[PDB]
Design an enzyme around this catalytic site. Structure first.
Site, short mmCIF file in Angstrom:
data_model
loop_
_atom_site.label_atom_id
_atom_site.label_comp_id
_atom_site.label_asym_id
_atom_site.label_seq_id
_atom_site.Cartn_x
_atom_site.Cartn_y
_atom_site.Cartn_z
N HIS A 51 10.22 -6.26 -4.81
CA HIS A 51 9.16 -6.73 -4.12
C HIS A 51 8.75 -8.30 -4.14
CE1 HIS A 51 7.18 -6.00 -7.91
NE2 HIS A 51 6.20 -6.73 -7.58
N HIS A 105 6.56 -10.29 -5.53
CA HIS A 105 5.87 -11.14 -6.69
C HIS A 105 7.02 -12.15 -7.41
CE1 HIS A 105 2.58 -8.03 -7.29
NE2 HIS A 105 2.47 -8.92 -6.41
N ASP A 124 8.05 -12.27 -10.28
CA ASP A 124 9.28 -11.75 -11.21
C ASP A 124 10.44 -11.08 -10.62
OD1 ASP A 124 7.28 -10.00 -10.37
OD2 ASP A 124 7.58 -8.66 -12.22
N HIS A 177 2.54 -0.12 -6.55
CA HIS A 177 2.31 -1.27 -7.23
C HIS A 177 2.09 -2.45 -6.28
CE1 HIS A 177 2.92 -4.83 -9.78
NE2 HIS A 177 3.74 -5.27 -9.01
N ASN A 211 -1.49 -5.61 -13.69
CA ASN A 211 -1.87 -6.19 -12.34
C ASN A 211 -1.71 -5.19 -10.98
OD1 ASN A 211 -2.35 -8.38 -10.14
ND2 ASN A 211 -0.06 -8.35 -10.08
#
Ligand SMILES: O=C(O)c1ccccc1C(=O)c1ccc(F)cc1
Ligand SMILES: O=C(O)c1ccccc1C(=O)c1ccc(F)cc1
Ligand SMILES: [Cl-]
Ligand SMILES: [Cl-]
Ligand SMILES: [Cl-]
Ligand SMILES: [Cl-]
Ligand SMILES: [O-]
Ligand SMILES: [O-]
Ligand SMILES: [Zn+2]
Ligand SMILES: [Zn+2]
Ligand SMILES: [Zn+2]
Ligand SMILES: [Zn+2]
Ligand SMILES: [Zn+2]
Ligand SMILES: [Zn+2]
Lengths: 233, 233
Positions: free
Chosen positions: B84, B86, B88, B149, B180
């Site tokens: 995804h 993000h 990280d 998420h 988060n």
């Protein structure tokens, strides 16, 4: 030297950091909800004895704390104060008591620890139930600034060294978002921090509950973070 | 322990853990608000080449990742998929691209990365736009379970080894509170998790985005945490 960090302290070990003559922080690490956090407490020389502020967050850590104290300082810990009821502050109190340490906390903290099921310090600190209250405790002053990170949180000041230990009511500068606030009083937290500022404006070293020490700018920083959290969406 | 934790991994370093024949996870660490978090990705052998799942959360870590792969495994990383948008997951895509790795993500992920000002994988993965969609990509199946998420999150299955990489849609067991979720779809997350269970009931290894691997129990665990957060636990 330079302050120890989480990546330098295996869980179960404890580091000491001398801040000034007769004043150390103790630093430990603990696993918590899928991460490892550092955690500070304080050690203050009390003649030929030591006053301990807060446990090392658990029994194993607190035993390691006492051993590291014996190794690096070699004076007996005779009293301990827990600055609020969470387990990074009272977890290990049983170990302290078994080692002959007289453990202390406010009636508020003792009350809340019992409700939570956490270890309960034996002796009560009187005279701290009202915001702005201060009492002497040997080489330190204990101060109740009002509710903040918790309703019972105390701060500790070492007048000889100008060291202010804010505990978890004060955030390190690196932390720009709120920590665990389940038990916090967000509405009052900035007001409580301002009480700290007004009572200890001469403080030169400010020690947060978690992370790197700094100066009094940690206070306004914390207020900024707390207010931003308050205004979340 | 056996699986590496943050205490075993200096920040900037990367560990590899072999899960099964031709299947590894890669583990790195990053600082987030004073605390250090671990993070998992996947490596899957495809013949004499390697497929990478997700960066190591940053340019420096991802460089270290490629160096560790060449040191320990010594087969070229030819393709990478980010699960995804993000940091990280796409943080380090530029490093991968510079190193000659073809980077991939869904069009949804690429768009969201762009809006976020994050690094953007080069190639767009077709056939993953609707919940329940799956496509084969070399030695793995990519699966879009629906929003969880994040609205774009993918999961990855290695059929040869019965390894399910859930990414950040799946929590490790030690994580009992929501992390988060700013970009999460809390309403759909449990439904999306059930699609994963339905599609991969034979999974033997389940890798969360952060922390310790386990089995399919991690799914219902995640659902429990998410529903509790939904109800303001
Ligand atoms: O003080 C904080 O904000 C904090 C920071 C990092 C990690 C945990 C906390 C925390 O609150 C905590 C609460 C309960 C407990 F048993 C131990 C700690
Ligand atoms: O996956 C998670 O829930 C998670 C766990 C630990 C730490 C961060 C996250 C996270 O969400 C994250 C969000 C944005 C970003 F750039 C990097 C990470
Ligand atoms: Cl006693
Ligand atoms: Cl006594
Ligand atoms: Cl390419
Ligand atoms: Cl290509
Ligand atoms: O705390
Ligand atoms: O993430
Ligand atoms: Zn606390
Ligand atoms: Zn006594
Ligand atoms: Zn704390
Ligand atoms: Zn994420
Ligand atoms: Zn290409
Ligand atoms: Zn994540």
């Amino acid at each position: 030297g330079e302050y120890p960090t989480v990546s330098e302290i295996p869980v179960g070990e404890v580091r000491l950091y001398q801040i000034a003559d007769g004043v150390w922080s103790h630093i430990a690490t603990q696993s918590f909800d899928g991460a490892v956090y550092p955690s500070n407490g304080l050690i203050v020389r009390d003649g030929d004895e030591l006053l301990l502020i807060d446990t090392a967050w658990g029994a194993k850590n607190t035993a390691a704390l006492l051993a590291e104290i014996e190794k690096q300082i070699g004076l007996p810990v005779t009293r301990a104060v827990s600055t609020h009821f969470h387990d990074d502050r009272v977890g290990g109190v049983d170990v302290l008591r078994a080692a002959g340490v007289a453990t202390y906390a406010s009636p508020s903290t003792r009350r809340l620890a019992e409700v939570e099921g956490n270890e309960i310090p034996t002796h009560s600190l009187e005279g701290l139930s009202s915001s702005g209250d201060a009492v002497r405790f040997g080489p330190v002053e204990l101060f109740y600034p009002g509710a903040a990170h918790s309703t019972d949180n105390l701060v500790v000041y070492v007048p000889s060294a100008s060291v202010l230990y804010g505990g978890c009511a004060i955030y390190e500068l690196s932390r720009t978002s709120a920590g665990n606030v389940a038990d916090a009083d967000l509405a009052e937290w900035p007001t409580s921090i301002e009480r700290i500022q007004q009572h200890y404006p001469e403080a030169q070293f400010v020690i947060p509950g978690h992370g790197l020490p700094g100066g009094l700018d940690l206070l306004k920083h914390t207020t900024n973070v707390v207010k931003a959290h308050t205004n979340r969406s």
